[PDB]
Design a protein around this ligand. Sequence first.
Ligand code: ZN
Lengths: 77, 76, 32
Amino acid sequence: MQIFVKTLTGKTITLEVEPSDTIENVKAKIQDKEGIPPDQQRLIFAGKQLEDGRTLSDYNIQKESTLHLVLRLRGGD
Amino acid sequence: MQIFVKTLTGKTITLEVEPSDTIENVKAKIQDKEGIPPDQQRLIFAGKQLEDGRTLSDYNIQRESTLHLVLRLRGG
Amino acid sequence: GHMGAQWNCTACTFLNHPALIRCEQCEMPRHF
Ligand SMILES: [Zn+2]
């Protein structure tokens, strides 16, 4: 399944993921493509930060959804 | 009852709906007025993107509410 | 910046994460 990720510089990358892929696997793909260590990735979808141990389905992420990569905020995790 | 749908260009569409109407039903009513296929519509209300398969009543959308229409590219 | 509250876009109402500075739905800036 394709999903999009808006990266830190404003470009958009496309990932091929399983329909219920884990968030950890998604971060692993982003690391390979963009170079960001998974521990430094913070992904937002539908106003929520995506969590390890969940899958894309937990968030109703589907074909051609767009996720946003962001920095860690002070006071955030 | 009437609800209102505001476009991002600031037009307000008036719709005639019922609490049991589905979000898809509402999108079809928007298509009748605006020509926009339902698969190009996102509706936002009270901070939430509304899901097809739910009703207005599931979202507590009461009379005279305003929804916001955000366009999208049709998903493939 | 700092973590703070989710914010409702004044254009479309969507409830956005504080790490985003433009609305996830309609791209309007939070601050104007
Ligand atoms: Zn918005």
